[PDB]
Design a protein around this nucleic acid. Structure first.
Ligand code: ZN
Length: 635
RNA sequence: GGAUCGAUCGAUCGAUCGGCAUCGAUCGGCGCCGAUCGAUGCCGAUCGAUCGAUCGAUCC
């Protein structure tokens, strides 16, 4: 039922000016959006009809919004549909838009439509609502819609432009340190989303706080381990692994430039990735030993990264969790290859494993962070026996690992399997949520706590300046609400005109396609896969090979999660077909009826025929060559 | 497969402050010392811009 708080938040969009409204709940935002839909469609007289469009970023919020919009719009004679990825092909989108009003499409569909040529203008819609509207920052699908609207408006061909109301729970601060910078960022958001009103609660603050989460920050800066025997053993393992890895390259230190590469840190992982991408462009002209040293090194660097991830886990989660992580990696990599390099590294791991299992089983080497995490979990489960603890870690490799520690520690018995009837849920990004714990990271039942366990004070100072930024954002929101309307309209017109001018400034022209027929090699294996003359791009994004000689150069493996993206259908994952390479290459797909595997340039390297230089690319847009479109008449 | 966002970290550049090292100008005392100003190199603290890596999430 609509209360005075929702009507006070929904007041400035009744007049007909765009808003960036802020409600801290989700159901209140949904009710306000439904109220704006009701008042906006009911204001039209006979002979005209409105086309209020709702945008939802993710699939579950799209399904929730589609269910709510279908449930409420039953007694008003209003039709409701929503389009998504599994709905995109089905029937053509122009017939859905032209024969309905309340489209709840996800924004990437509209971005693809306005890029294609369908939906010739944004003036068909009469109101536009943006769920989670502070995402309109840079190159977002919401921002692509807003760039289209600003090019339609400021170009001089503006017609019946839609109202551009928003929906969020936080305006955001960004890279702002002073109050003028926060005001500049909020004005930049208001100009990019093209609004002159920021609606927030100013009078009915008493009934607002009945659903507000209101966290209680309880930071605990607690020191790390002292007796690092496992770190000593595996650090010696990286030391002699890197020393034996220098028997094939005499300039491994000259490949990278990131110094202070201490083990167990993200800086070491960055050094490992940089030295892997530095070795991956190897051009020794023997072309038979080159595959051998590239395969050997790649095994060395994947072992090094696996060891570094083992100490990152052992720093955060248990010692034994690092041991099972390394044992699982060696068990999965033993079946992939049986050469001298793999056997040598595996027999080195079993020659260290006899002391590794002795060190890991020692109960005097437990992590102190896990000890006081168990202590605080014990005391909050003792205070209340129905606490749902959310646990935020940095990586998914910890997500099961801490869970195994939850399945390993005998002092706790009220913790239950909840890896994401579940007592504790451990995840990485986002319900009751009575307790939140952030383990080295940076709902209902009000009175919640948000513990933060870090071995560094930088995260504590970041959360302190985050609280200062929240207070300063609320102060800048009140300051912008105190301003006059016409000066704010002139300000957002100036800011969005400067934004449109600097957007048209960064319009790079078409790059030229390189005329040579370049050859693609494996990342880890350096085998002849295909030439670029046989590389056809299908829908200006996806690339494939129609070569008959390419068909025997790969092998198949069953896909764990097939899912029909766009008009394609996944069937299997393709891999390199050799003795001990087994490198990922792409994915087996069906377009309409053919089975032509689509590759990714991420797991490939590009070599030219004349110069012979090997180039490393991560996205297909960075690759500039003769992009011949895929013709179905050939194969 | 392709795109998008967020957190941490790295590289480069610029700005503010402090410290070390070096070269010149003025004043005072008995060639030496104290003070300030001007310039260069390095490091530390903070901020901004660009690029990248990892991790996570999202969409098509
Ligand atoms: Zn291969």
């Amino acid at each position: 039922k609509p209360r005075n708080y929702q009507l006070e938040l929904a007041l400035p969009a009744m007049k007909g000016k765009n808003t960036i409204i802020c409600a801290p709940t989700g159901c209140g935002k949904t009710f306000v959006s439904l109220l704006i839909c009701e008042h906006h469609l009911k204001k039209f007289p006979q002979g005209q009809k409105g086309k209020v469009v709702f945008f939802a970023n993710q699939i579950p919020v799209y399904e929730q919004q589609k269910s709510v919009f279908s449930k409420y719009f039953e007694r008003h004679g209003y039709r409701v549909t929503g389009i998504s990825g599994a709905t995109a092909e089905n029937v053509p989108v122009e017939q859905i838009v032209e024969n309905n009003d309340i489209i709840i499409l996800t924004p990437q569909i509209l971005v693809n439509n306005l890029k294609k040529g369908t939906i010739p203008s944004l003036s068909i819609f009469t109101l536009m609502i943006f769920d989670e509207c502070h995402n309109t920052s840079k190159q977002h699908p919401y921002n692509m819609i807003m760039f289209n609207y600003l090019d339609q408006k400021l170009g001089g061909s503006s017609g019946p432009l839609p109202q551009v109301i928003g929906l969020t729970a936080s305006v955001g601060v960004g890279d702002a340190k002073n109050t003028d910078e926060a005001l500049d960022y909020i004005c930049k958001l208001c100009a990019s989303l093209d609004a002159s009103v920021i609606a927030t609660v100013k009078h009915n603050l008493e009934e607002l706080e009945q659903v507000v989460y209101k966290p209680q920050k309880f930071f605990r800066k607690v020191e790390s381990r002292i007796s690092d025997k496992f770190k000593y053993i595996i650090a010696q393992l990286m030391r002699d692994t890197e020393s034996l890895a220098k028997r094939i390259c005499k300039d491994l230190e000259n490949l990278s430039q990131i110094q202070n590469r201490e083990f167990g840190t993200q800086k070491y992982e960055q050094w490992i990735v940089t030295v892997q991408k530095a070795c991956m462009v190897f051009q020794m002209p023997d072309k038979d030993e080159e595959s051998r040293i590239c395969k050997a090194l790649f095994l060395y660097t994947s072992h090094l990264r696996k060891y570094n991830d083992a100490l990152i886990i052992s720093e955060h989660a248990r010692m034994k969790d690092a041991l099972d992580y390394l044992k699982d990696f060696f068990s999965n990599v033993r079946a992939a290859g049986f050469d001298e390099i793999e056997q040598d590294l595996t027999q080195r791991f079993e020659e260290k494993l006899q002391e590794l299992e002795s060190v890991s089983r020692d109960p005097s080497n437990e992590n102190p962070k896990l000890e006081d995490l168990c202590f605080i979990l014990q005391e909050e489960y003792h205070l209340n026996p129905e606490t749902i603890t959310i646990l935020f870690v940095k990586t998914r490799a910890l997500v099961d690992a801490l869970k195994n520690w939850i399945e390993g520690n005998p002092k706790l018995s009220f913790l239950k399997p909840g890896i994401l009837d579940h007592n504790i849920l451990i995840a990485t990004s986002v319900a009751q949520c009575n307790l939140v714990i952030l383990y080295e990271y940076v709902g209902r039942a009000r009175g919640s706590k948000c513990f933060l366990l870090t071995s560094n004070a930088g995260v504590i100072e970041k959360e302190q300046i985050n609280m200062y930024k929240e207070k300063m954002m609320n102060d800048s929101i009140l300051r912008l609400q105190t301003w006059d309307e016409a000066v704010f309209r002139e300000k957002i017109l100036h800011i969005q005109t400067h934004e449109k001018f600097i957007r048209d400034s960064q319009e790079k022209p078409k790059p030229v396609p390189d005329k040579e027929n370049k050859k693609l090699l494996c990342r880890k294996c350096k085998a002849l896969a295909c030439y670029t003359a046989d590389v056809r791009v299908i829908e200006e994004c996806h690339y494939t090979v129609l070569g008959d000689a390419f068909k025997e150069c790969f092998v198949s493996r069953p896909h764990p999660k097939p899912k029909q993206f766009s008009s394609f259908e996944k069937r299997a994952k393709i891999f390199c077909a050799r003795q001990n390479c087994s490198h990922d290459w792409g994915i087996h797909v069906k377009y309409k009826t053919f089975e032509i595997p689509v590759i990714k340039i991420e797991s490939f390297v590009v070599e030219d025929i004349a110069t012979g230089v090997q180039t490393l690319y991560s996205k297909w847009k960075d690759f500039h060559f003769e992009k011949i479109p895929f013709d179905p008449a050939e194969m």
